Amino acid sequence: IISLTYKKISLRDICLKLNLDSEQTVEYMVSRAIRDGVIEAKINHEDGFIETTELLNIYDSEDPQ
Amino acid sequence: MSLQHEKVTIAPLVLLSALDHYERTQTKENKRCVGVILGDANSSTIRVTNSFALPFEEDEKNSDVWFLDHNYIENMNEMCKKINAKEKLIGWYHSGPKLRASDLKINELFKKYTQNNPLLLIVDVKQQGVGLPTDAYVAIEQVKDDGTSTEKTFLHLPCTIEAEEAEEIGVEHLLRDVRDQAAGGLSIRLTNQLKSLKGLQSKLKDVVEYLDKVINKELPINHTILGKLQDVFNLLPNLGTPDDDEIDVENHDRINISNNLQKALTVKTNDELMVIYISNLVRSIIAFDD
Amino acid sequence: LIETVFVKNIRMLSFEDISKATHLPKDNVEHLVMRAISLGLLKGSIDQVNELVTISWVQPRIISGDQITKMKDRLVEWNDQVEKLGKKMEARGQSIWV
Amino acid sequence: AIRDEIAKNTELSYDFLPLSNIKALLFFNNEKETEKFALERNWPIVNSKVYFNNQSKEKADYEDEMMHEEDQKTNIIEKAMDYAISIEN
């Protein structure tokens, strides 16, 4: 939910929203989860936020086949 | 005189005629047959309506020695003029397996009767190849950039076949076959597809080994042959361009209609599925009284 | 300019390669290309934003001993390419060749 | 076991961590252990930035190097051939 609603959101805010313990703790969550593709995002470790990568419009890709 | 031979339409009647005359003189073992070609000219398409044989004995010591009856020709022409008066000399057919350079001197002889540029129609009587058994040529004068003066030479004319409405239905009456080159049903175009692709693959193989024969075996260099290959390379399609991405998008669209129509027919057949089963229930009642 | 496009199998050139060949600034590569179009010795269009000259048509010219070899190899690649591909097409759709 | 699992996940997340940020996440007690672990796992540390993307390229290349491959991905021609022959039985 947090990733869909806020495209770019610092881990700091997620801690506030979902009461996670620290920046690290949620970092680990996302890191494991995107290997599975659940969240479908990429982390910005230097800038301190999660940047979502879902954008859509695969009627330019070859996906429909 | 002129070049107006851009298309040559050939009646199927003439091809059948050519084989009949070839056998009824029984010219075999590298003997030739020559007959006149009658038909229209002064039109970009050349219409081959009719032919008739001329007596022509071709030597076996040489190819430069032949007998041809000039007096015969006019008589055949005036008679056929009485039948239909749209027929004039437009050339002569040679029935050899392939082309000769002693046909050039014969070509010049028929230039006298014509008011067009003589068509040499090599009617093959060997039915070689799955495509046409006709190549066409017309004798034309050129100079060329090599340093060659006043050449006479034969330039290939693309060959096509047209037939009249009465003529075409005669074929249909005679034959009932379904034609390995036909583009009919799904299975038939599937066969045409693989046949067409391998057709190109054969011709391209010849060019590659023809190029070797120029540059190691000293076949002649000509700018008409090199120039055509240049065109191929210059207008060659390219992929990964924005043209390619639109193709793929056009390609999903066609895959989309197919998927819709696949689902549509499942509904119709499932309707039949039910109705066989209802009919069974009724027929069970009938069977019990029976 | 006509030479470099034809002999290459690519038909896009960065101005950097043309500038170093003809010893021109970028100002004059843009004229040179423009003149080729006016005369009709080449036809194409320009990206001064990609900084390419994308040529799309080359005038046929005389073809010499060296070029025939270049022309030839291009034809071998395409000839082999149909042949490998036609095997798949023989293999696929086996049931129906009717 | 914990280090390798974290090592996999971090490839997706980003392309580089400074050396210090690697040591905390992948649980070491020496910075020299961190760097040696990276070399053996096929990450280059060049200017104190790891390049997770090396090993992933290398694994991916291997897959394309073996050949089982044309039909698993299924060409365009293959799909269209399949349609017609299902109908025509």
UniProtKB/Swiss-Prot annotation, chain B:
Location of N-acetylserine modifications: 2
GO cellular-component term (any): proteasome complex
Listed InterPro entries: EIF3F/CSN6-like_C, JAMM/MPN+_dom, MPN, MPN_RPN7_8
Keyword vocabulary terms for this entry: Acetylation, Phosphoprotein, Proteasome
Keyword Phosphoprotein: yes
Domain MPN: 8-143
Modifications the protein undergoes after translation, according to the UniProt entry: N-acetylated by NAT1.
Molecular function GO labels: metallopeptidase activity
Domain of life, source organism: Eukaryota
Gene3D superfamilies referenced in this protein's UniProt entry, alphabetically: Cytidine Deaminase, domain 2 (3.40.140.10)
Keyword Phosphoprotein: yes
Pfam families attached to this UniProt entry: JAB (PF01398), MitMem_reg (PF13012)
Entries under PROSITE patterns matching the protein: MPN
A biological-process GO annotation: proteasome-mediated ubiquitin-dependent protein catabolic process
Note: Present with 19800 molecules/cell in log phase SD medium.
Protein role: Acts as a regulatory subunit of the 26S proteasome which is involved in the ATP-dependent degradation of ubiquitinated proteins.
Family of this protein: Belongs to the peptidase M67A family.
Protein name, UniProt field: 26S proteasome regulatory subunit RPN8
Lineage of producing organism: Eukaryota, Fungi, Dikarya, Ascomycota, Saccharomycotina
Gene of this entry: RPN8
UniProtKB/Swiss-Prot annotation, chain C:
Full-protein positions shown: 296 to 393 of 393
Protein name: 26S proteasome regulatory subunit RPN9
Its job: Acts as a regulatory subunit of the 26S proteasome which is involved in the ATP-dependent degradation of ubiquitinated proteins.
Transmembrane segments: none
Miscellaneous comment as given in the Swiss-Prot or TrEMBL entry: Present with 12400 molecules/cell in log phase SD medium.
Family: Belongs to the proteasome subunit S11 family.
Domain of life: Eukaryota
